[PDB]
Homo-oligomer: 214 residues x 8
Amino acid sequence: ASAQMYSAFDFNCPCLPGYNAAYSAGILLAPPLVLFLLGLVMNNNVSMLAEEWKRPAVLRYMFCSMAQRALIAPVVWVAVTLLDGKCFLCAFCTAVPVSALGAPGLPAPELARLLARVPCPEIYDGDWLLAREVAVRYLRCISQALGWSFVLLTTLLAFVVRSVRPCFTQAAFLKSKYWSHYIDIERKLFDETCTEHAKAFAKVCIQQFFEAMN
Amino acid sequence: ASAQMYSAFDFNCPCLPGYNAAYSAGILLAPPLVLFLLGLVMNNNVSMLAEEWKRPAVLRYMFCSMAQRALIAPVVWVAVTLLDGKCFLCAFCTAVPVSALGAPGLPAPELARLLARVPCPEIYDGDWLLAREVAVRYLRCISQALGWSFVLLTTLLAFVVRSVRPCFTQAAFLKSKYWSHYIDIERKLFDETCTEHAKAFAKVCIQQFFEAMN
Amino acid sequence: ASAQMYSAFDFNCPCLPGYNAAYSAGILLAPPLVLFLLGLVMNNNVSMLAEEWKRPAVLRYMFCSMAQRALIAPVVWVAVTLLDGKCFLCAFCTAVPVSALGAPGLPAPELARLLARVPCPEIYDGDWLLAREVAVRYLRCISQALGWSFVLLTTLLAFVVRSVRPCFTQAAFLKSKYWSHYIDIERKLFDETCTEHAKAFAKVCIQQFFEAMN
Amino acid sequence: ASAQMYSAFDFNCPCLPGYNAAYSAGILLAPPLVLFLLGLVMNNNVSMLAEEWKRPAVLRYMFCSMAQRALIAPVVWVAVTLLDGKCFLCAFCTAVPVSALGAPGLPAPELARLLARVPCPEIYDGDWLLAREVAVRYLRCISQALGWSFVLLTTLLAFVVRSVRPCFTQAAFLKSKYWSHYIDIERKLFDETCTEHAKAFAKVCIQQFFEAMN
Amino acid sequence: ASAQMYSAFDFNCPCLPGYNAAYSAGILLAPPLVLFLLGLVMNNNVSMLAEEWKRPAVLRYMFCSMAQRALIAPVVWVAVTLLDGKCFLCAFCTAVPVSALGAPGLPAPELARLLARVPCPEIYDGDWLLAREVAVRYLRCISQALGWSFVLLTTLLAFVVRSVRPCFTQAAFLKSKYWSHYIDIERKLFDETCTEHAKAFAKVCIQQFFEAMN
Amino acid sequence: ASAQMYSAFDFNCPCLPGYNAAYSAGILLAPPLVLFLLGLVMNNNVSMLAEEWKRPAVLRYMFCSMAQRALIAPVVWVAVTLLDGKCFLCAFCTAVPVSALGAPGLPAPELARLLARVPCPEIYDGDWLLAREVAVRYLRCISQALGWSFVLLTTLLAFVVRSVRPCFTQAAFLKSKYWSHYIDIERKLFDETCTEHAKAFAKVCIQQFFEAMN
Amino acid sequence: ASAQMYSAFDFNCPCLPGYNAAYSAGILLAPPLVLFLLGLVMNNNVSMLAEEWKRPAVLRYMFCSMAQRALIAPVVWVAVTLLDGKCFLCAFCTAVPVSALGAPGLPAPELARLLARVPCPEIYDGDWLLAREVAVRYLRCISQALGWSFVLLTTLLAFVVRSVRPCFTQAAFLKSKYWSHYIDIERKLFDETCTEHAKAFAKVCIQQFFEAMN
Amino acid sequence: ASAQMYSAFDFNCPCLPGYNAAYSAGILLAPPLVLFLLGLVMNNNVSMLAEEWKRPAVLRYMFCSMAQRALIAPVVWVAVTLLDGKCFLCAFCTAVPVSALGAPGLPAPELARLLARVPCPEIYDGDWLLAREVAVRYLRCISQALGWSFVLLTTLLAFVVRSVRPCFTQAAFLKSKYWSHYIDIERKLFDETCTEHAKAFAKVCIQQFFEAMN
Ligand SMILES: CCCCCCCC/C=C\CCCCCCCC(=O)O[C@@H](COC(=O)CCCCCCCCCCCCCCC)COP(=O)([O-])OCC[N+](C)(C)C
Ligand SMILES: CCCCCCCC/C=C\CCCCCCCC(=O)O[C@@H](COC(=O)CCCCCCCCCCCCCCC)COP(=O)([O-])OCC[N+](C)(C)C
Ligand SMILES: CCCCCCCC/C=C\CCCCCCCC(=O)O[C@@H](COC(=O)CCCCCCCCCCCCCCC)COP(=O)([O-])OCC[N+](C)(C)C
Ligand SMILES: CCCCCCCC/C=C\CCCCCCCC(=O)O[C@@H](COC(=O)CCCCCCCCCCCCCCC)COP(=O)([O-])OCC[N+](C)(C)C
Ligand SMILES: CCCCCCCC/C=C\CCCCCCCC(=O)O[C@@H](COC(=O)CCCCCCCCCCCCCCC)COP(=O)([O-])OCC[N+](C)(C)C
Ligand SMILES: CCCCCCCC/C=C\CCCCCCCC(=O)O[C@@H](COC(=O)CCCCCCCCCCCCCCC)COP(=O)([O-])OCC[N+](C)(C)C
């Protein structure tokens, strides 16, 4: 439910020397933060939970669970961005070593107005000190290697929580389990009494509804 | 049920210096207002609700509920417009800084008749003071950043109503729950009596229908 | 069941100065009128309804209902025509301000024989006083804005009938409800007697059908 | 089951001055007549119906019904032909006003051998007195307007038969209803007796079929 | 099950002056004759039927039925050939009036070696006395008109057999009906006795199959 | 299950004067012979059938049946080859009458090295005595006519076996019918005894499997 | 499950005079050997079978069965390779008769460095002694003929094992049949006892699980 | 669940002489290691297993099983990389024998800056000592041969574990089987008691929920 957005969600990368960090860093942080606290609003175990959490048990449970199953969305929508390589080229294009690993120099301020124009766009000035195909696929390299290094740092970190017992014990987990299926039971518990008691005054008001004219 | 309309619904953007604000602001406000008060007409809990709401309980409920589930359509059809970037370029094209972040100047009134012609269309005059690919993807940038900032302002705002108790208490919600499944019950309550009582005069009039000729 | 016709139903727009109003206004009025009184012929509650409606109750009901559910087809097939913009350009092409918002003039009658040739077709004469891409997408603008203004005038108008009680009361609606499922009941009421009574003379004539030769 | 034939069924339009009326009028009349009396052969209530209809009741029913449900095929396969515009251009191409609404004249007989060559084909002679794109889309206009005027003349006419009582009364309709489900009942009536009586001589001849060798 | 073959079944039309009649008339007669007596071999009511039909009742039935339901395949695979127009152009290309309705003449035998080369192929000699696009779409015209005239001659002829009583009476049809479901009954009649009697010697030979080693 | 192979199974046609007969006749005989004796290996009524068929009843049955239902594969994969026309052009390309029905002559041996190069390939030498499009579509003609003549010779021949009684009588067919469903019955006959008798020693060995440690 | 791999599995054919035999013979032997002993690992009747097959009955059965049903994969993935013709051209390209059936000669070692470059690749040197289209489609011929000759040698060989009794008798086949459905029976035999006995200590440990706090 | 990632997961191959080994070896090791210890986190038999595995039976089981079924993902995502040939060309491009099997030499350091630019990219310098199509499809050869040699080394190695008894005996496997379906049984064991005991205080608190106002 994350990578599908990346198919049609376009990317812009404004080639202006100094706004790049914004639009670059803007797209890598916002969707995670919005995806995180959006799926959290979907789990129905949230509403009353913060209600009684301010008056002064299960105080350390029923919040770690939501924190886990709702924290899979951001970590995937932040890894797929790195592996593509369009979010990284847009940002650090202004800091590629020119005279080496690219020869002649140029003035300082105008150069930033030149090298900043070497993402994907077809408005790049061209020849001097750099060929566009050589600049890219070098920054795309550093992203993907830095990318895979990220997911190792997470998937390994997902091996301790599901293998160690942070808040997984019979202190409140078992007790909180007692809250599991009472509420939905209360849905079909009072509903039968509610639906039945509605039948009490049903026939009473229904008097004129039987027949008369027909 | 919102983004699907944006697939085939064309966009025009009339390159005339002064009507742009209309056609731009026209398309960003109308569909929300029409989508809002259209889904509201779909919920069957609306008809009698305004009926008795003028004679002088549940006065503060049964209207907030409809206001919520029917207010998801506009907020999505107003975010997708920003992220695309065709509604914003059409409007503020007349206020892009020319001499900087774009050099030679020109007369005032004719310039508005020139810069106003730089959306998507292929009738742009061209060279002076601006390249068309540089104008766009700078306004497309400001939209998307302003766009994501919008949805954060909403999805976070969708975290207080579903986590705080605005009109969520046992004052009328429980009482209004008693109105929940009586009406549909009344559908199949009098129907059995109605369908049965119809069988009363059925055999009476059916006398000549048994047989005679055959 | 309306917009699907607009996919393959071609459009012609004859570039002749004076027939345009016909073929333009012809296509915007006829399909509504034919769609309206066609779906009306589909509701089975129509046949006897006009029968007894001329001899001199439910006189103000059982006709407003059909008038509603069968009046959704035209209002949609008349909004989709405006939003496209091909029905409006074909008509008012002869009244676009030339010397402004388009320079040199020309004779009166021949001009109508020129400006009338600027819809979609690729037979337009060309240069003088107007560029074809500038004429269109200005009339396409006025249509869409006028279009959305239409649907607001209707969807809002669809909020009073479903929220006010024009003919929605227990004067004949409840009485007319008594006619609801008697007729279809009469279908399977006399059918069992008819199908049964057919079995009366069945065995009588079936005498020679048992066996003899075999 | 009508418009589908129009997808792959090719059209020819022989550009010969005098056969056009044949091939034009030929394709607009034949498929209706063949579609009409073809679906009539499908309704199983036809066979004996004409049998006893010549020896000298239901004499005015059981033929109007078939005449209705089998007369929907032609009226649709004759409207779709008009709206397309390829059946009309092929016919009246020889009678388009040349000197006006099209300038120099020509000899009479050769002209018919020229104007007759202006349907779709790419063998048109060209320049004089008419541009091919102007001839078509003027005759295509007159067809579609004449087309929609047709379907109004029919769909309105389909509003009197389903709203007036031509042969819809309890004179023979109810009596003819008695013939409704006897015949199919006679199918499974004698079949059980036939299938059963077959079991009579079944075991009789089956004597040598039990066992002996095995 | 007929027109589907016409999709991939290629057509050749050998442009040789004198073999055309063969390959043309060859493809219009053979598939009907093969389709006719092929579906006839599918109806299981054929095998014994010709068996006892030579020793010297139902003598005039049980053969007309097969003759009808198996004669729908050829009549459709012979109409679709005409309407296409590739079977007719291939044959009568040698008899198109040249000097009229097409000017200069030529020698007799070589002309047949020229006009015979004007089907679809792109090896036509060209200019003299005929343009290839004018020859075709004139013979394609005569086919389609002659084609529709055919299907009228058949579908009308299909209105007398299903409306008159050629061999539809209670002379052998009812008697032959007695043969309808006895045979398939005999399938599951002796099968139960056969399957049962097989169980007789089943346990007898199964003696060593119970157990011993295990 | 035959024509599907002809879709992707490529064809080569080596243009060498003297190997053509091999690769041509090679592909028309092998797949039939392999398809024939392959489907024969699929019918489970084959294994023991040849077993007891050599020791010295049903001797003339139970082999004609397999010979029929397994001989439908080759006759279809040998007709589809003719109708295509690529198997025939590849073979008899060396025997097309050149000086007539095609003018100047040439030496004998080199000519065979030329005319042999006129299948589909684009390495044909060209001009003299023959145009490539005229050679093909003449041999493709003779194949298809010879092809349809084949299938008539078979489908008609399929009308005598299914209408005459070659080995269709109550001499061994009825007796062999007694072998029909005993074997599969023997599958579920001893299986119940086998599966049951397995339960004998099941509980005996299962002693240590109940419980002890747990 | 074999030919599907051949769709996307690319082929390389390194045009180097002397490695061709390796990469050619490498791809024709390995996949068979890996497919053979891979499907063998899938049949669950293999594990214990080799276990007791070394300590010193069914010694000649239960291994021939696996050898058959798991030997269908290689024989198909080795026939499809021949019929394509890309595995054979890659190998024997260095041994095509040049001076005949292809004229001028050349030095020995360099020639091998030339003729070795005439597979599919577009780096072939060209003119002398051979045209690339003539070399291929001659080796492609010898493969396909040699290919079909292969499958005849196998499918015929598949007619003796399924028609003769190599290891098909009541010596161990019937005895080994007794091992057929005991093991899976043992799955659901001890499972019911295991699942039941688990219920023994279930209620014992479940004491504190009933209720107390709630 | 492995090869699907290889469809859209792009590949970069940065043509810089010395980073190639990193990006090459980086992509061949990381996904295996991440796929391995990711599927391991999916098997629910892992959590408590490491818990009690540190306090100082089944000590040598319940870890070999997970090690097997979760070690199929890496071995497939490491074989598909070799067979493609894009991971190997990217690495060893700097060590292809130039003067042989490719003539003139060049300086040492610049040469590495040239030969390193001969993967897929279209920035290769060109002519001297090597043609790009000859370099590739020679390294692609060595990969595929080395590739198939790999999978033989594994699939054969997968024949001993499933045919020998490493940890497959009745020492702890049978005992560990006793842990198989108790836990899920404990899910629906205490749940019925938990769901039931919830019904204890259900009616107690439900007192005010029956009726009063209605
Ligand atoms: C068509 C569909 C497309 C498919 C996509 C294909 C491509 C796929 C590519 C890659 C797939 C990678 C999968 C990753 C592993 C997922 C599991 C996981 O992580 O769960 C853990 C998450 O919670 C944590 O414990 C981690 C928290 C670490 C902090 C990270 C900061 C994030 C904020 C951003 C700031 C960054 C700033 C720094 C910027 C550098 C634990 O929760 P869980 O509930 O126990 O997990 C259950 C695991 N299970 C589900 C298997 C059992
Ligand atoms: C193929 C399909 C395409 C998919 C699209 C993919 C792209 C998706 C992109 C983005 C997705 C973004 C999702 C947003 C969050 C939705 C939820 C929500 O907001 O609900 C809230 C809405 O009601 C409110 O409380 C907000 C009201 C704020 C006022 C906004 C003005 C709007 C008028 C316009 C004037 C603007 C003028 C100013 C112009 C700047 C609360 O109601 P709820 O019932 O409690 O919500 C339940 C939430 N749940 C559903 C999860 C539980
Ligand atoms: C993918 C699919 C494609 C879809 C197509 C999309 C395009 C659609 C475009 C258009 C759709 C138009 C629909 C038309 C209305 C149909 C109903 C109707 O007409 O029934 C009537 C027909 O019988 C009559 O009463 C009319 C007879 C008039 C005579 C006409 C001459 C015809 C002969 C030719 C000579 C011409 C010579 C003159 C030449 C100028 C009455 O019968 P009914 O049984 O009561 O009808 C029930 C109606 N109901 C079904 C709703 C209840
Ligand atoms: C994707 C699918 C493609 C669809 C195709 C779309 C295109 C469709 C185009 C057209 C459709 C046309 C349909 C035709 C009508 C069919 C019905 C019929 O004819 O039955 C009759 C046939 O038997 C006869 O009575 C006729 C015999 C006349 C002799 C003809 C010679 C044929 C031999 C050749 C020598 C020629 C030599 C002369 C050369 C000039 C009677 O039998 P029935 O059992 O009572 O019929 C039941 C009718 N029902 C089925 C409705 C109830
Ligand atoms: C997408 C799918 C593609 C569809 C394809 C579309 C194209 C279709 C085109 C054409 C379809 C043609 C169908 C043909 C008829 C089939 C029936 C038949 O023949 O059965 C008979 C076959 O057995 C025989 O009796 C014939 C034996 C004659 C010997 C032929 C030599 C063959 C060896 C080669 C050497 C050649 C050397 C000489 C070279 C010149 C009898 O057996 P049956 O069991 O009683 O048959 C039941 C019939 N039924 C099934 C209807 C009841
Ligand atoms: C659309 C879908 C695409 C399809 C793809 C098509 C292409 C397919 C192409 C090829 C398919 C190849 C299949 C391989 C066989 C799989 C089975 C197997 O191996 O299981 C074994 C794995 O565990 C082991 O025993 C092997 C461990 C060896 C160490 C390898 C190092 C790996 C680390 C990397 C470092 C490398 C460093 C060195 C670099 C050179 C045993 O476990 P099992 O549970 O008993 O297996 C059951 C087998 N069964 C499943 C049949 C019963």
